[PDB]
Symmetry: D2
Subunit: 343 residues, 4 copies
């Protein structure tokens, strides 16, 4: 019958955390990058990838002034970032809490290939995820991120890939909710190929419907979850051009057809679009005439940090400059989150 | 890939019809009853079941005065009622349109047992449903009704029953949308047994999640559909008592966890509760603090017609009395639909 | 829990019927053809399609001499053929039983389009199928036929098409088994297009796995069922040529990977191949080195009747000639069924 | 479309390994007990659980004389056992190969609870399973074991538990097949509770059908897989008694209704029955009149080692006695595998 996956107290705590993450005007700073993922980001500047370099970069992102506080509602950290400290000895999770944000952790262990598929992948990281999530909860991490990657090809995403990603996302969400951590469901769809806005919307609708069916099957408390979907955008190789209004219409329509309103909020990912483009698209999404029952916030890695890194240059002389770039980009993204971004 | 099940014109027409059915302050009069279904209602008075008696009763329901126009946004008719005429010779569908309502038709052919299940049933009626729906469209019917019946037992509803009912509802919706008729999805759950509010909410969430996953799988245009679910209520044999606020909380919570906002509106069925109880529950649902992205209207068979039938008594002398009874009940249900019903 | 869909007596009767249909050396004569389906067959000669012409053709097929008896274990009849009589006043079902065969009936009501799919179709015929199957059981029909049509395209068959066809086949099987009639599951895959043997095998494996999962979900007694799949063959437009040994290998491999051994037998359909080609393919399948746990028989409409119809010419003078043609073709197909066909 | 999960060489190697494991007269010795799992076994004697004690016990199991060679076709080792050596310095995998057996490894990382279920669990171990399976392949392990635990309760196994266990088994099988390792699919159903033989058969059929549907969905090469299901037996608390012939009938019937013949063989697990009971049940299963298309062998942990461990007593003086006990038990189980076990 009905065996409560979560007690009312656990549901209340998860709802409180999720609503704090996507509180009005607040979004998510996705600062979770592995050693190799941030290696490409640091190599574009010319600065070598070291433990101290990573720590200083994340301190620069996290030690922003008071103007970032009402704009960043949560920060996703990598495993090693959760246990680093700021210059004053203050731990990074405590630095995030002191700014009013919610500490997050990337709990997925990357993608692995799916046999019999056209290069399609499923995400791993469920092994010992209960113990890991409990430890992260004791270490200040109140929500988790699990990046499930799907792409659009002539025969992709397949039924197997969508089902696998939805099932693994639901299992991750169940484990996180059992451990008191809000799971951010990310059925990210790669904007790779010549597929247009219509096919991206169709694929996003199918993927999100399967994801939420899997979440229902796993007894996931949707009020204690957040969604991190790809913006419904044409592929990078698509010749046809779409305005930000059309992209917003497609994204909001795809969300309204699949996502139940119980979801606390939808925190979009940039997904390979520029900082200004991501902010404008988020603003258009929040300005969409269609009624949007969720908090449509941002969870941006590149769209909040590309200019910050470029201004930083890897040297301490531009600490304040990179901080200012990141801060004003967070201001713009918060304005887009409230629908009041006018570039 | 993405093969459009409906052209943008068909989607626009379905959305227009669905929004007209559940326009603010308007609900649905479920006047659909087979010969045997209305036989029990007519036998409760002592009036014999004839073609003329059925015609006069449905004329009484349909030819109400002007105050019932802004309260009834749609009327579900039986097959024979769609082809009957009022006393002035004006056909019943045209009677409905002349009052601003939307003509509906019961297209399901009843429930049939599912083998290997504990008395569970699936609904038939898909044979020639395309031709039937096209004919109904030419005859004025703009939306269709398909009653899928589920119950709650110690091992019920099973995976087979939920899956089969969701699949048949999705097929019915696909056929209706292809024929230009708005499908009202009714995954009705019987309030039979001693199950409490919590288990009814759990079963409703599971059934609705499966139903909307099936609708997604069948490429159903959810903006051109309406939902007719059971109010989340304890079973008739349940000893524990629940307030109307608790029932509204459970119902709205179950809807928000499974129903996507793209659904034009949710038209509740009475499901064996009294007229006053149904109206109070609808009012409490529309007064629920949780944000409700859909038009929460009524689709009441007995909750709109029981008092009218008793007042009528089967004789022509109480025509005006039964008209006034039905009209005031529809006014109350419309007030509940807007959340302004104060008995 | 486990609610028996069938009593042990029902299971015993279904197993007895199914084993009688596919008894060693015996196959199925698929004489089931609607008025329009047989219209093209009769128009290839120039003979007008009348009730008497259809009756005489089916009598010619059914009134064969004693040499057809050990080769035809079952005959599928159309609805009107089940209620026609031979020249001597003997009803056609009784004519079939007098020859040791098992009377079958086409219970599906044709295919209907699936919305949102690339020309994919699902089969209807479930409305009142319980009453129809009971009546057929009283009229001598001991097994039923349900043709589900799938094709192979660049994006076809889709998940929706495979799932819906499997579900409708499982519902048909449940109804037939409840009514004491052995359901012949036919997830026929069209050999249309340029797809090769490998892709036909892949699609057949996927379709059959989904079909048998649906049969399990519907509590279908597989020992009281038969399978009527397409031979795994390259498409009609495929340029690459495959030997009969390769086709047999692919077909037997696809059956062994999906079909559980509980299935009484697999009765292949010709599916657009010539009579000699179908017989040679069946012989090669029964000569396949891989162990085959089921009775691999034939269920041929065109491959058993093409030459008989051509020799008949629509006139009574060639009655004996067409009878001999059909009889020798049945002998060849029985030899292929036992693996002893040497043309 | 059809993307080959495995090349024909990979399929040939997997089929060769699987057929070597379940070659006629040969079964599987399951020595895949973790430190805590074998702790209870060693505490039944009073011998402390040490690295040396575990090594000597597994050497005693593995270094048996020549007469045990044609009875054990494969040995499943724990992770630490795969890297231990015999007394003569010969590694345990090489000891297994020298006896004609196939080295196996337990790759699952135990069961974890499923939220919202009645104490139901899912199995973890997919993280880095590709690299682990590749390393095991380089270390001599040619097949892998993944124990998925299911139980029978008043509402258990649920749809979520069956679906998730089948999906994780399919993912494990895909990874193992990609790494050249034959996956032994074990959807073990606990014989706990008062459920009878009929309900165990029903649950086993449902679980196996879901498992093989998941294997089909994940493009698993079933010829390169083996099945390790529970013998269909009544629960431990069941009052009704069933004969060995009845248990064999139920088990073979459940296997024939769900397991496709492409599976190389079915290696039963003891599942809490005595050694003699397991051998008699295996003999009755292989003596079942129903045609069995697979090699019905044994994969016994307790049924092959319980009396051998008891005779060992934890001291070196009973090395020969315990080896003789294990050898004669393996001879009995091989005789049961060929159906020639007469106690």
């Amino acid at each position: 019958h009905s065996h409560p996956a979560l007690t009312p107290e656990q549901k209340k705590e998860l709802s409180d955390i999720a609503h704090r993450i996507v509180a009005p005007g607040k979004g998510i700073l996705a600062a979770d990058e592995s050693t190799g993922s941030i290696a490409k980001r640091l190599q574009s500047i010319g600065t070598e990838n070291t433990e101290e370099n990573r720590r200083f970069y994340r301190q620069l992102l996290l030690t922003a002034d008071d103007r970032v506080n009402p704009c960043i509602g949560g920060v996703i950290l990598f495993h090693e970032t959760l246990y680093q400290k700021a210059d004053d000895g203050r731990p990074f999770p405590q630095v995030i809490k002191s700014k009013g944000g919610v500490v997050g952790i990337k709990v997925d262990k990357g993608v692995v290939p799916l046999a019999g598929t056209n290069g399609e992948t499923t995400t791993q990281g469920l092994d010992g995820l209960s113990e890991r999530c409990a430890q992260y909860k004791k270490d200040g991490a109140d929500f988790a991120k699990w990046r499930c990657v799907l792409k659009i090809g002539e025969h992709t995403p397949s039924a197997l890939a969508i089902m696998e990603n939805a099932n693994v996302l639901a299992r991750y969400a169940s484990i996180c909710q059992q451990n008191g951590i809000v799971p951010i469901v990310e059925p990210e769809i790669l904007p790779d190929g010549d597929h247009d806005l219509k096919r991206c919307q169709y694929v996003t609708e199918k993927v999100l419907a399967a994801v939420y069916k899997a979440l229902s099957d796993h007894h996931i408390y949707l009020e204690g979850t957040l969604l991190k979907p790809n913006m419904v955008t044409p592929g990078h190789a698509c010749t046809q051009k779409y305005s930000h209004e059309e992209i917003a219409m497609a994204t909001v329509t795809a969300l309204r057809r699949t996502v139940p309103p119980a979801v606390t909020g939808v925190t979009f990912l940039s997904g390979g679009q520029s900082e200004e483009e991501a902010s404008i698209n988020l603003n258009a999404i929040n300005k969409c005439p269609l009624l949007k029952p969720w908090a449509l916030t941002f969870s941006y890695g590149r769209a909040l940090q590309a200019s910050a890194l470029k201004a930083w240059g890897g040297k301490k002389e531009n600490l304040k400059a990179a901080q200012e770039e990141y801060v004003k980009r967070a201001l713009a993204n918060s304005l887009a989150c409230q629908g009041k971004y006018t570039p």
